[PDB]
């Protein structure tokens, strides 16, 4: 069991990093279950537009934290040969729980 929790503020960044990881691991390992998508944490913030009222003008923004899962099955060495540190994306964030 090698869980790879992928999280980010950018969906294309998550897709890029996750697909690169899976492409690296596909040359060594099993019929990997691959890139499963998880629901996104949506944080909304409503803000009154103008300081010092005009109460009914407020606009809101939304941040969204995207999550992806990998679940590599039976990776041995060549998988982690292409894994240690080779990635470009910066806004991506990776965790590994076993």
């Amino acid at each position: 069991k090698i869980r790879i929790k992928l999280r980010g503020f950018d969906h294309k960044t998550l897709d890029a990093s996750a697909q690169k990881i899976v492409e690296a691991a596909r040359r060594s390992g099993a019929q990997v279950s691959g890139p499963i998508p998880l629901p996104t944490r949506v944080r909304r913030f409503t803000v009154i537009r103008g300081p010092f009222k005009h109460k009914d003008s407020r606009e809101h923004f939304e941040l969204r934290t995207h999550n992806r899962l990998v679940d590599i099955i039976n990776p041995n060495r060549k998988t982690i040969e292409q894994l240690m540190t080779l990635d470009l994306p910066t806004g991506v964030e990776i965790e590994i729980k076993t």
Partner: protein
Amino acid sequence: ARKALIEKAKRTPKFKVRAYTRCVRCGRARSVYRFFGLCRICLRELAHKGQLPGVRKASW
């Protein structure tokens, strides 16, 4: 707001209840979002600038 009234930053408030948010940039007295540490006006301007990652224009 007032410099001295950001006295919360050295917290030592003599009592744990007297902690308030006091938005970092503008020194907001009343309305502060705890997650960004900013206030609605500072949050508005900073999200307009593009310095808060992931913040988009909500629409649905």
